């Protein structure tokens, strides 16, 4: 409910501080134990090149 | 030690607005023989951003939509009032001033309306410089047949509208607005000379409005203004903002640009005044002789693109001369001095040929204005108009002489 | 200035400017030495004819040398004189020299907006689009606002060459200046976005 | 119109009916920082979107700290400096970063107790 | 909220005098 209240105010940077990533990096490894891979890709809006984030 | 060392307007002028949330910062309203004005009461130091000079609440204005349908903001006309039918019968393009005049006369009749009080500080019929109030003899002093015919059509259009809508059978609530044609002509004159057109957002509705804005219709015109108007949608306040980074001295007049890019004949048709330093005034040349545009601009330090000429003797008339003189340009080809002197000489002859069209000269008109004792406001306006044009042509002859010599 | 001095300057500047327009830098140099022999001091407009004569005959080194003569003589170059050098540098693709001259005009307290507009168009015209983008962005990020004609030129030429990164940078600066993008500008970006394989 | 010059001064010539113990309250308003609260609302009246106003203030505050690191974090706060500067840019007058101090402090070591 | 929408000539060329 605290996350919802912060989102309702639109305080995006306060929410980021209060959440921080180890929570997501640990999630990827547990999904890997089930033979699933979760890759995070960034597509550049300038040259359309895809970057695989180090997760 | 401290022991050994233009009249101010009526104090009630600012007070009636002030008690209704009008705020003025660092400026004072001063009155002279030529009319009201806004002057810096102190040294307005430059800042990183535009400074707030005046704040005018929306509820003190008289505004109507520029485009059909006609809605009033704030809505003051009651539903079913016959004044709306008169407003609704107008030409959407040409009769914007008639619509504002009907609203203005209607506003004077309302007991609670602010312009009942503010209307007493508007120029009277013999004090307004609008050419709608000019007699046929005042138009004879313009020495401009095109402008005279334009004014006569304006006066004809305004008069016929009153005769059609203020006949004998109209209700008393309509008769008492404009009991005579001169009363309605005066209202249209106020509408033309004082209307401010802006794009505004009111709530969620963005629209173009023709606005009668008190205390902002006291700002005089300048083609190099130190102030500009800014609508603040959130609280519905018109802001008068001084230019960012521009220092304004105590006593300096606060001005806005009424009509960007418009010639003096347009300023005369709308506001009944002209300026000798109008940077958009034009003079009809034959084009047989042309000077070097790049040289002329650099001699007088006129920089920027043609539509945004500015000066780093040189004033708006020299900028106007650059735009109106016949010019040639060949990228970076330099001009031959002996061929440019022939053009300058021939351009000066054509400038003197046009000064000889006027029966009098510029200084004779200037001394005529000083000798006046019982002259109508429009008569002096008509003389100032023709004198300004003579001053502009004379400025071109001087500028060409300077340019011809600085080309060595 | 006496009447005799004015009479000689007219005929000396007549001969000088008739050889600058004749694209004869050698002749324009002879007249300047004729002025020195007569005792007349060459002003900014005499060295302008020397710069133009070299500039018209695609001679960047001689025109730069003529500018050094003008500066070495203590004269102040005209704003038009610098524009002739800036436009010449762009025609040869010399963006570094074009930017050095623009810095000089700012130092001389001139208005570099018009000369910056000329420099970018010369590079685009002479197929130096890569150099043009570098010069354009530096001016745009520096606060100068380009013409709507040049904005439409830079966006379209970049998208025809498949350079979406520069075309997107410029269109962002175009709106920051105060000119909002229209359907034309978006259609230029879409022409490249449709070929990236990511719908 | 023109008469010699003598001219008619414009006056109200019509009736407008629309025409002291707050010292403790005023001084408390400044002490608690309510003045900046009104200034923030004043600045937001000139802003179309309050979220971009917050981002712009933070961006300007970051520039202050990079420029002059040691002057912020104590009595002068960078965000308060930005807000006071933007009020002064409108032409109004505010103290720098809204910083004020107690003049009746009985020397060093003494903390005012709430 | 605040996260919406990504949040030398003329030198050494003087008059000798
Ligand atoms: N720059 C200028 N030169 C001469 N008259 C001007 C002017 N700017 C504004 N005016 C006059 O002011 C009118 C616009 S309303 C401006 C206030 C007006 N002086 C008044 O006392 O009510 C116009 O009709 C015009 O006659």
From TrEMBL, chain A:
Name the domain of life this protein comes from: Eukaryota
Entry's localization field: Plastid, Chloroplast
Which segment of the chain is annotated as a signal peptide?
Answer: none
Q: How does it assemble?
A: In plastids the minimal PEP RNA polymerase catalytic core is composed of four subunits: alpha, beta, beta', and beta''. When a (nuclear-encoded) sigma factor is associated with the core the holoenzyme is formed, which can initiate transcription.
Q: Which family does it belong to?
A: Belongs to the RNA polymerase beta chain family.
Stated role: DNA-dependent RNA polymerase catalyzes the transcription of DNA into RNA using the four ribonucleoside triphosphates as substrates.
Q: What is this protein called?
A: DNA-directed RNA polymerase subunit beta
Its source organism is: Sinapis alba
Which part of the entire protein is covered?
990 to 1072 of 1072
UniProtKB/TrEMBL annotation, chain E:
Location of the protein in the cell: Plastid, Chloroplast
What is the annotated quaternary arrangement, including any partners? Answer: In plastids the minimal PEP RNA polymerase catalytic core is composed of four subunits: alpha, beta, beta', and beta''. When a (nuclear-encoded) sigma factor is associated with the core the holoenzyme is formed, which can initiate transcription.
Biological role stated in the UniProt entry: DNA-dependent RNA polymerase catalyzes the transcription of DNA into RNA using the four ribonucleoside triphosphates as substrates.
The family this protein is said to belong to = Belongs to the RNA polymerase beta' chain family. RpoC2 subfamily.
Q: What is this protein called?
A: DNA-directed RNA polymerase subunit beta''
């Amino acid at each position: 409910m605290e996350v919802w209240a912060l989102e309702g105010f639109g305080v995006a940077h306060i929410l980021q501080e209060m959440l921080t990533p180890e929570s997501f990096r640990l999630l990827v490894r547990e999904l890997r134990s089930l033979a699933l891979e979760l890759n995070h890709f960034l597509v550049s809006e300038k040259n359309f090149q895809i970057n695989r984030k180090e997760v | 030690f401290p022991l050994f060392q233009l009249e101010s307007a009526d104090p009630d002028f600012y007070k009636i607005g002030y008690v209704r949330r009008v705020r003025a910062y660092g400026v004072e309203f001063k009155e002279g023989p030529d009319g009201f004005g806004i002057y810096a009461s102190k040294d307005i130091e430059p800042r990183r951003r535009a400074r707030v000079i005046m704040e005018i609440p929306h509820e003190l204005m008289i505004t109507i939509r520029q485009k059909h349908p006609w809605m009033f903001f704030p809505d003051i006309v009651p539903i079913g009032h016959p004044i709306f039918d008169i407003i609704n019968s107008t030409d959407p393009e040409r009769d914007w001033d008639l619509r504002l005049a009907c609203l203005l006369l209607f506003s004077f009749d309302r007991e609670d309306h602010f312009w009942r009080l503010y209307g007493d500080f508007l120029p009277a019929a013999d004090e307004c410089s609008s050419l709608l109030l000019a007699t046929e003899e005042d138009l004879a002093e313009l020495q401009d047949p095109q402008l005279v015919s334009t004014i006569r059509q304006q006066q004809k259009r305004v008069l016929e509208f009153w005769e059609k809508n203020w006949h004998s059978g109209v209700p008393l609530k309509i008769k008492r607005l404009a009991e005579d044609a001169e009363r309605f002509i005066w209202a249209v004159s106020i509408a033309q000379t004082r209307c401010i057109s802006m794009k505004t957002r009111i709530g969620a509705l963005v629209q173009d409005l023709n606005m009668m804005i008190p205390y902002a219709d006291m700002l005089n015109h300048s083609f190099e203004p130190n102030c500009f108007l800014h609508w603040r949608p959130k609280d519905r306040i018109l802001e008068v903002m001084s230019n960012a980074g521009q220092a304004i001295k105590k006593g300096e007049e606060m001005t806005i640009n009424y009509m960007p890019g418009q010639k003096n004949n347009m300023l005369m048709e709308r506001y009944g005044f002209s300026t000798p330093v109008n940077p958009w005034d034009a003079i009809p040349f034959s084009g047989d002789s042309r000077i070097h545009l790049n040289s002329f601009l650099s001699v007088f330090n006129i920089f920027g693109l043609p539509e945004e000429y500015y000066h780093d003797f040189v004033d708006g008339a020299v900028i106007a001369a650059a735009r109106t003189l016949p010019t040639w340009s060949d990228i970076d080809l330099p001009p031959i001095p002996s061929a440019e002197r022939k053009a300058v000489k021939e351009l000066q002859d054509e400038c003197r040929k046009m000064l000889a069209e006027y029966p009098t000269t510029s200084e004779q008109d200037q001394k005529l204005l000083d000798s006046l004792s019982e002259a109508r406001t429009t008569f002096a306006t008509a003389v100032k108009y023709r004198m300004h044009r003579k001053m502009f042509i004379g400025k071109i002859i001087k500028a060409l002489d300077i340019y011809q010599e600085r080309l060595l | 200035v006496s009447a005799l001095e004015r009479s000689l300057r007219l005929t000396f500047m007549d001969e000088l400017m008739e050889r600058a327009r004749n694209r004869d830098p050698s002749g324009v140099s002879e007249v300047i030495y004729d002025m020195i022999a007569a005792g007349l001091s060459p002003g900014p407009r005499s060295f302008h004819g020397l710069v133009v004569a070299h500039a018209l005959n695609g001679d960047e080194q001689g025109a730069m040398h003529s500018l050094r003569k003008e500066l070495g003589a203590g004269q102040r170059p005209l704003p038009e004189t610098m524009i002739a050098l800036v436009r010449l540098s762009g025609s040869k693709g010399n963006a570094q020299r074009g930017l050095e001259l623009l810095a000089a005009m700012e130092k001389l307290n001139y208005d570099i907006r018009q000369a910056w507009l000329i420099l970018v168009e010369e590079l685009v015209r002479t197929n130096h689009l890569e150099e043009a983008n570098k010069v354009f962005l530096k001016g745009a990020r520096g606060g100068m606002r380009a013409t709507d004609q040049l904005y439409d030129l830079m966006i379209e030429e970049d998208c025809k060459a498949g350079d979406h990164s520069n075309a997107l940078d410029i269109s962002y600066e175009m709106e920051a200046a105060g000119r909002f993008a229209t359907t034309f500008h978006f259609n230029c970006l879409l022409s490249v976005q449709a070929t990236c394989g990511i719908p | 119109g023109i008469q010699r010059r003598i001219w008619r001064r414009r006056t109200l010539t019509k009736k407008d009916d629309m025409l002291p113990f707050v010292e403790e309250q005023v001084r408390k308003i400044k002490e608690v920082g309510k003045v900046m609260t009104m200034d923030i609302e004043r600045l937001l009246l000139s802003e179309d979107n309050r979220f971009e106003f917050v981002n712009s203030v933070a961006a300007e505050a970051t520039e202050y700290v990079e420029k002059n690191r040691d002057e912020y974090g104590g009595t002068k706060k960078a965000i308060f400096h930005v807000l006071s500067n933007r009020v002064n840019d409108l032409g109004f007058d505010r103290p720098e970063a809204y910083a004020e101090s107690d003049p009746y402090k009985p020397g060093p070591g003494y903390l005012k107790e709430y | 909220g605040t996260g919406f929408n990504k949040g030398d000539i003329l030198f050494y060329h003087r008059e000798f005098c």
